Amino acid sequence: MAVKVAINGFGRIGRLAFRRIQEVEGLEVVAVNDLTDDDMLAHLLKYDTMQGRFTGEVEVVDGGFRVNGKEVKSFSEPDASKLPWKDLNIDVVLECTGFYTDKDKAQAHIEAGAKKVLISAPATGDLKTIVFNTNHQELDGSETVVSGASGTTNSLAPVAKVLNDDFGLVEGLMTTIHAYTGDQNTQDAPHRKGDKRRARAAAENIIPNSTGAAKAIGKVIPEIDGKLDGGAQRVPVATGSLTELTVVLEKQDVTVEQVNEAMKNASNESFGYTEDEIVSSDVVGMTYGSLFDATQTRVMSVGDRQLVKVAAWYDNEMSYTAQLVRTLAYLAELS
Amino acid sequence: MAVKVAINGFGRIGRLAFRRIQEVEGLEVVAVNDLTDDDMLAHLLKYDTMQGRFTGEVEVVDGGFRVNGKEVKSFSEPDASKLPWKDLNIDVVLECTGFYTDKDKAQAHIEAGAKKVLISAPATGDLKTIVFNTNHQELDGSETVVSGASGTTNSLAPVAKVLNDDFGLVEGLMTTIHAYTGDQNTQDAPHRKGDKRRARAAAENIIPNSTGAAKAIGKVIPEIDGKLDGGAQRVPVATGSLTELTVVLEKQDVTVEQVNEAMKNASNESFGYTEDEIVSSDVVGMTYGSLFDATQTRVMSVGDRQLVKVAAWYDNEMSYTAQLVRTLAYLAELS
Amino acid sequence: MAVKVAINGFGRIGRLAFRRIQEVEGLEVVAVNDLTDDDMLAHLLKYDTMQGRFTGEVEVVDGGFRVNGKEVKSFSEPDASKLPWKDLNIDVVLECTGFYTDKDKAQAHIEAGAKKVLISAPATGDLKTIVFNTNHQELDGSETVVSGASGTTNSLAPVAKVLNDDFGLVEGLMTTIHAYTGDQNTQDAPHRKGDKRRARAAAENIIPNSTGAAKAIGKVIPEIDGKLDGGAQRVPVATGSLTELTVVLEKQDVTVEQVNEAMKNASNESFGYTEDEIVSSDVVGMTYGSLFDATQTRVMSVGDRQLVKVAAWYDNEMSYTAQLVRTLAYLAELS
Amino acid sequence: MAVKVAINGFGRIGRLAFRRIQEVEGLEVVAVNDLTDDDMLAHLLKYDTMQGRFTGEVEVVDGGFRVNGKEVKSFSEPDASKLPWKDLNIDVVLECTGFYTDKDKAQAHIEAGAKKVLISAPATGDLKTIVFNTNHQELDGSETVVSGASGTTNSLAPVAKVLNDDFGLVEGLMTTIHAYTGDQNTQDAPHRKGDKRRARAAAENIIPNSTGAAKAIGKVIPEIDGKLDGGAQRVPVATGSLTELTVVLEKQDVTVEQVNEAMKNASNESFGYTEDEIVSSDVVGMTYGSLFDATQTRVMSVGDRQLVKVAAWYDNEMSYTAQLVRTLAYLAELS
Numbered sequence A, B, C, D: 001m002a003v004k005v006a007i008n009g010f011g012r013i014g015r016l017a018f019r020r021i022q023e024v025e026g027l028e029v030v031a032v033n034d035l036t037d038d039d040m041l042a043h044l045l046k047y048d049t050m051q052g053r054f055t056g057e058v059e060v061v062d063g064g065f066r067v068n069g070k071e072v073k074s075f076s077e078p079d080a081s082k083l084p085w086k087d088l089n090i091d092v093v094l095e096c097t098g099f100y101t102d103k104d105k106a107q108a109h110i111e112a113g114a115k116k117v118l119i120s121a122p123a124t125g126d127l128k129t130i131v132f133n134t135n136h137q138e139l140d141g142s143e144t145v146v147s148g149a150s151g152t153t154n155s156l157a158p159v160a161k162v163l164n165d166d167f168g169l170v171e172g173l174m175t176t177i178h179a180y181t182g183d184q185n186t187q188d189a190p191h192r193k194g195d196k197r198r199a200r201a202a203a204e205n206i207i208p209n210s211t212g213a214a215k216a217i218g219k220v221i222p223e224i225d226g227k228l229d230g231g232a233q234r235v236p237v238a239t240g241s242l243t244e245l246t247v248v249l250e251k252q253d254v255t256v257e258q259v260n261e262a263m264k265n266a267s268n269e270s271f272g273y274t275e276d277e278i279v280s281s282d283v284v285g286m287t288y289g290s291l292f293d294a295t296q297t298r299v300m301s302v303g304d305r306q307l308v309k310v311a312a313w314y315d316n317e318m319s320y321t322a323q324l325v326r327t328l329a330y331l332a333e334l335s
């Protein structure tokens, strides 16, 4: 039958990965783990502020919940090493808690009996960081623990690859205007990780913040390692984000048209192209990992010296989740 | 010299109580306790999203911080029983963590050496619940643990008293349209206390939620115990709230004017009166505990049967804080 | 073939009425009028911040736009008396500009050649005010200008009817906690109609405001004329709203359960029932005119005197639009 | 006595300039013009969602309003050529309506009798564009119509000057993450100027949009004419903005520290310097034209090739307004 998936952390990425799996044959979520009870899990699956009402039926049953007639087993175990993955025969854990973002920590799922772990974030340790349709083919099926990178990395990789392949990337700087996330406080309050900015009221501020997306791009595209860096501004939309990239290229006399054309030629189910004057809410729930926006391309030329600026939208939620689940499927399929 | 105050929980209420104590002679905050470091505390005192920049100078120093030339000792101790209150000679603890909202739990501060505790919230146990300028005179100086009630209770009490004194309260229902607070999640997520509504994205929803304010009004005004109940709708403003009360009265043929008049006559530093067409942002940072809005008075008469509706604004932060600090001062002065 | 509909004012209600007519056979929108060009119209139809991407294809063509292979003629004419309705054989104008909310003013469409007008708001003059599934049967086919009421009226009517039929309505008061609309300013600015509250930053305040919904309920349910009144708080969500109604009933010893069952028994495609602890975003895009929320029903009893409170959600946009289009269909079919 | 000022367009910039003039001696606002009545004007002066309650007393009087005992005459006249500026002896009109942003159009105030006009925006035609403390010394007193530039320009100019003087500006690109403003729609609607992005729900989207600030910088700093370009993202905060500038410099091996120090050395009352990890609400109401944020400086070095990124905050309202008022004072003082 299907690939057996357990989701660890039924949060934003967890539940959306659950929804998305509902429309990909060969994958079944058989178990979910988190820190709450079934009443709350079922409820947050059914209702979603940004992504909309869940389409199927959800019902609390014994030991978990039923979704469109399928039993999902649920657990409330903060220590992953104690999860009953061996008895459940879990083929892949989707690790979406935010607390196991390291090869050695995530290993706990393997000890508990899962065959492989896919982490919904950048992760430290000796493992591959994968953006689907940019470098998934670097997976060979011997990996046990894999990172699915970040929303920002997924928005940036296909854009950066085209810039480098077609024009030769000398260097660039990124800013991501990014929806606020669960890691920010509702009101000004002490922040768990001592970040004085993620401390502030999330929905009432433009908030500068760091991201590894550009700095660690070299893990996704080794041939440009060290050539990008940048940061983020977290702003008050609840999901939907934009990556602006300003670069220096080797090729001279570059034009808006050549850049846009090159992006369009690279488009697929991960990397979308648009020429419509859209805004963030238009990309909520979209399944492209990156939507290239040709209306935002600019070229500064002073004499023979040029800066090239481009921008790609991503739903930091659904865009990333759709990539995560593509990498999931590919990863499972290799065994 | 001054009354020695320690603040437990340097959060929204804690920091604002600190600010407000800066302009009230005879009160000095000598200690603060929370779960973070000085860098974070100093920072959140200096900067405040809704309430504005702190006016004085704040500098991180050894074992705490200096504010306008005064040393504040700071601690990072979750178990209150362990705080050095005896060494510091604490006269009153302002208990503003949200975790000691009960007479027996709050007792921990007394064991630790504080003479008295004032809790920035409704609290269970055998103790007095005080709304300044409605029933603060019920304090005699033999109390060790006192509750300052809630924001909503302070908004409501003075309105409820006038209605009862002047018209005879038969019964009523309340809804507070309330700013969202720190116990709501930033994004849809499991809620610590299992509340499926406080679980939702705070700044993106109208959220029905409970409040004891009306049900427990009888602790502040015994003679109307059991006559009020109601709830809240948490909405996306970061601070600033409104209490609507709909009531049945014993007196007949009541008019809008008679109600407004009676409210105006009862106005003081705690209970304000306005006839201007204001909106929530207008009351941010105000120091009335309750601002009666005459433009919102409504009287429904069918034959000889009437419903009377009124509304009072409050800054759930600063209004409550100003009331809290008035009570603190009165409380400390009684010994 | 189909009934020929022209939409006047391609705004929030106009474009959603357009979307909604795409899925109701026997109605075709053949013309649209507004104050802009086709580029803008096509665009606002394609992309909708709260209601999501339009599903079909939209293309600017000559003299209007093409939707799913169908030609829509578009005009840019502020004076309705000059629209080419006679030439286009318009059966019904859906009047959604906010500028023709009066029988005599709306008469301009009839002079221009439309057979009938349906107004997407309360309207003054000698005409029927219709809430589908509460009093649409009051239409006999001799009306030329009809009002579809307001979102609030549509949320309230079916609730008020069950209350009266099953308990005897004595009197009541309403508050609707309501998403902000286009008649509010983005920033504090002079307000076109002199309302000092609708003048304020819409997305940054809780804003009291008037509404005729309750006061004029007797146009929809004559037997309770004069027994309801109340107002609105406009709050920062971009669509989705809640009506709170506090009532006195002739029936004594009423329980929460009795009220809830009576509501459930009246449910249909206009009046939904829920027991889930939902929040405003959960109703965005729903097609019930009114969603009764059983979780919010309260009964305050003091001796034999009771106040009953209930609450019904409505997407002020899509709920109202769904009702408007049901009324449109029924209206057109009577001829 | 004082310089006589009239404010045309008592909008955000108009009212804030009015407040700010209350604390600059030698300036008196004697008259205000807009399109509303006195009730509305007085009210919007008193109450301000982001900027707070006005401190003095405001009272509607005959033919205007009284502020702190001073009579302000008010008018309701859309055609500036008809304003009674000669009878009032206006020395300067502050042109803040957004409808006279051109030398020839603004001439109308001169014909009506004003001696000089200062425009609260970029303006076309033969006139000087002034950022106070960057180029106000280019004013000689023979100017009759002057532009105060934009908030963005005022944020950018001092930053760009330091970059050019100390390192040699080769070229650069700018993005401003900007609070939404009054020219955006509350809900998705046709936009007055045909802009399909400014058409969208302002407080629910990240919205790319154009700005002349970088492109026209050469009007403020001639020696870098043509070297900058860029755009804006309008995001959901009601006021408070950030300018990010990414540049190529002549000087090689530039460091973060060198850049920051050079910015600190240039600081004055128009150009602030900070090393605190602040967020947008922290700059609401600040009087710096530009607040340089040292924590956001980055230097990307690949071999011998560098990009330098910096960022400066501004309250697009109060920062701009304080700059406008300083230019007003200097302008009037030259005659």
Ligand SMILES: NC(=O)c1ccc[n+]([C@@H]2O[C@H](COP(=O)([O-])OP(=O)(O)OC[C@H]3O[C@@H](n4cnc5c(N)ncnc54)[C@H](O)[C@@H]3O)[C@@H](O)[C@H]2O)c1
Pocket (backbone or CB within 6 Å): A008, A009, A010, A011, A012, A013, A014, A033, A034, A035, A036, A077, A078, A079, A080, A096, A097, A098, A099, A101, A120, A121, A149, A150, A151, A181, A182, A183, A316, A317, A320, B187, B188, B189, B190
């Ligand atoms: N845009 C995004 O939200 C986004 C995009 C890509 C990746 N990510 C990453 O994915 C991860 C999750 O992000 P999120 O936004 O979904 O966070 P979230 O807070 O919504 O989800 C975390 C969930 O996991 C649960 N959890 C926490 N500790 C646990 C434990 N020890 N055992 C079991 N369950 C536990 C929490 O209760 C919560 O339900 C993070 O690493 C985040 O950085 C987020």
Ligand SMILES: NC(=O)c1ccc[n+]([C@@H]2O[C@H](COP(=O)([O-])OP(=O)(O)OC[C@H]3O[C@@H](n4cnc5c(N)ncnc54)[C@H](O)[C@@H]3O)[C@@H](O)[C@H]2O)c1
Pocket (backbone or CB within 6 Å): A189, A190, B008, B009, B010, B011, B012, B013, B014, B033, B034, B035, B077, B078, B079, B080, B096, B097, B098, B099, B101, B120, B121, B149, B150, B151, B181, B182, B183, B316, B317, B320
């Ligand atoms: N926010 C309001 O509108 C408001 C109004 C009236 C009353 N209150 C009440 O005041 C209390 C706190 O309110 P708040 O909004 O400031 O909460 P908050 O979210 O700001 O948190 C308060 C602080 O308590 C600290 N804390 C938590 N546990 C602690 C511990 N064990 N020891 C020491 N410090 C600890 C937290 O780190 C935080 O800084 C609550 O009881 C609340 O209901 C709040």
Ligand SMILES: NC(=O)c1ccc[n+]([C@@H]2O[C@H](COP(=O)([O-])OP(=O)(O)OC[C@H]3O[C@@H](n4cnc5c(N)ncnc54)[C@H](O)[C@@H]3O)[C@@H](O)[C@H]2O)c1
Pocket (backbone or CB within 6 Å): C008, C009, C010, C011, C012, C013, C014, C033, C034, C035, C036, C077, C078, C079, C096, C097, C098, C099, C101, C120, C121, C149, C150, C151, C181, C182, C183, C316, C317, C320, D187, D188, D189, D190
């Ligand atoms: N939006 C809601 O929540 C809601 C709910 C129920 C009823 N309504 C009512 O429907 C009507 C429209 O509401 P909306 O919120 O969709 O407004 P809106 O501002 O989005 O739409 C009005 C549209 O009509 C256009 N218009 C204005 N004058 C015109 C004219 N003279 N000729 C042609 N076009 C013109 C405007 O350009 C705009 O597109 C109002 O009466 C409103 O009260 C609104």
Ligand SMILES: NC(=O)c1ccc[n+]([C@@H]2O[C@H](COP(=O)([O-])OP(=O)(O)OC[C@H]3O[C@@H](n4cnc5c(N)ncnc54)[C@H](O)[C@@H]3O)[C@@H](O)[C@H]2O)c1
Pocket (backbone or CB within 6 Å): C187, C188, C189, C190, D008, D009, D010, D011, D012, D013, D014, D033, D034, D035, D036, D077, D078, D079, D080, D096, D097, D098, D099, D101, D120, D121, D149, D150, D151, D181, D182, D316, D317, D320
């Ligand atoms: N909002 C900002 O951050 C900001 C910053 C710098 C400059 N500006 C510029 O300042 C100008 C005004 O901006 P705003 O945001 O205060 O706009 P606003 O809409 O808030 O105020 C404009 C005012 O002009 C009045 N008005 C319009 N036409 C008029 C007429 N011809 N005669 C008399 N009064 C008229 C309106 O009633 C309104 O009060 C614009 O040119 C704008 O670009 C805005």
Ligand SMILES: [Cl-]
Pocket (backbone or CB within 6 Å): A181, A182, A183
């Ligand atoms: Cl995150």
